[PDB]
Ligand binder design. Sequence first.
Ligand code: 4A2
Ligand code: 4A2
Ligand code: ADP
Ligand code: MG
Length: 321
Amino acid sequence: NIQVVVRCRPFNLAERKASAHSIVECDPVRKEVSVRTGGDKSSRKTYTFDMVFGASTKQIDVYRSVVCPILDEVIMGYNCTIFAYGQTGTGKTFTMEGERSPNEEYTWEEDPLAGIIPRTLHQIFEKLTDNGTEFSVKVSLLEIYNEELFDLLNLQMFDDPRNKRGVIIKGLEEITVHNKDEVYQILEKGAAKRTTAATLMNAYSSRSHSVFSVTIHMKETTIDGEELVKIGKLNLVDLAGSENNINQSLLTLGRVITALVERTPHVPYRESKLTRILQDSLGGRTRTSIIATISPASLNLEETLSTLEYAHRAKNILNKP
Ligand SMILES: COc1ccc(/N=c2\[nH]c3cc(C(=O)O)ccc3n2Cc2ccccc2C(F)(F)F)cc1F
Ligand SMILES: COc1ccc(/N=c2\[nH]c3cc(C(=O)O)ccc3n2Cc2ccccc2C(F)(F)F)cc1F
Ligand SMILES: Nc1ncnc2c1ncn2[C@@H]1O[C@H](COP(=O)(O)OP(=O)(O)O)[C@@H](O)[C@H]1O
Ligand SMILES: [Mg+2]
C-alpha cells in the first residue's frame, strides 16, 4: 500500500554556472532512474520505481497520476498521506504547493503551475458537488521544526481518547473552506507569505516539515431519513530537506515506513512528533505515496544517490532485464 515515485526537475542556472553536467536519465516507460556514478564513464546504477517523472513533467501530470486515485480513496472515508522527500532545492515545495504563473495569467484553479495542494482543494469541490451530496471541508497547516509544533495559519499534542491511533493538537487552527473563492483566498495568502519571507525564514522552512491536512465531512441520509456522516482526511506533507545533523522526525518516519513495508510487528509511531501526527493515516487500508525529488546535476551526486537508495529500499523493485 506504499507507492514510491521519483520526480526529477530540470537543470537550474546555479548548476549551469557551476559547470555541472547531467548524470541522471529518466525513463517513465520502464519506470527507471539511471545515475552516472563515476564522475569514470561506464559506472552507472539503475533504480526501478512505481513511476518516474522526468524534467518535462507538468504539475497536472503528477496530480492525475499520483493524487487522483488517492483522493478517491479519501472520499470513500479513509485517511491517506502523500509525502515529498528529497534534497533542498529539488522540488518538494514546487510539487506540493506549486505557484502562480506571472501576471495573473490564470486563476489558481486553472494555473498550470499549481501543485498538489491547490489542485486537491479544487477537485474536492468538483468531485463532491457533482456527486450531489452535502459536505464540508476544513484545512490546517502546521510546521514541525526541531521536534516542536507551529501553526502556519495562526501547540501541544495529546493522544485522542476517542481514537486509539489519533492525536489531538491543542490550539491548532482548522479553517472551514466554504467554496472555491475561499480556496483562492487561502492560496493568495500563502503565496504572499512565501514571496515576502526573508532568507532566514526560507531556511527554517528547508529544515522543517510542513503538514497540510484536509478533512472532508460527508453527509448521507438512509432511506428512512437517518443522518450519517463519514470523514476522510488527506495529509499533504512537504518534508524537511534530506541532505546531511539528524532530523528526528525524518529518521523516525523512515523507520515507520520500513516497519510498514517489512511488516515489522512494532511500528515506532510514538518516537516522533511527525509520526504521532500521521499515525492515523499510515498503515491500514490506506494508500500512501512518496514522491522523491532529485536534481539531474553532477554537483548533487551524493545527495541524489542517497535519495534514490532510500526510495529504492522503501519499495524495492528488481530491475527488469
Ligand atoms: C518560509 O516560511 C513559510 C513557510 C510555510 C508557508 N506556507 C504557507 N503559509 C501559509 C499561510 C496562509 C494564511 O495566512 O492563510 C495560507 C497558506 C500558507 N502556506 C501554504 C501555501 C503557500 C503558498 C502557496 C500555496 C500554499 C498551500 F496552501 F499550501 F497550497 C509559507 C512561508 F512563507
Ligand atoms: C537530515 O536527517 C535525515 C536525512 C535523511 C533521512 N532519511 C531517511 N532515514 C531513514 C531511515 C530508515 C530506517 O532506518 O529504517 C528508512 C528510511 C530513511 N530515510 C528515507 C525516508 C525518510 C522518510 C520518508 C521517506 C524516506 C524515503 F525512503 F527516502 F522515501 C533521515 C534523516 F533523519
Ligand atoms: N519540476 C520543476 N520545474 C521547474 N522548476 C522547478 C521544478 N521543481 C522545482 N523547481 C524550482 O526550483 C526551485 C526550488 O524548488 P523547491 O520546490 O523550493 O525545492 P525544495 O522545497 O525541494 O527545496 C523553485 O524555484 C522551484 O519553482
Ligand atoms: Mg521547500
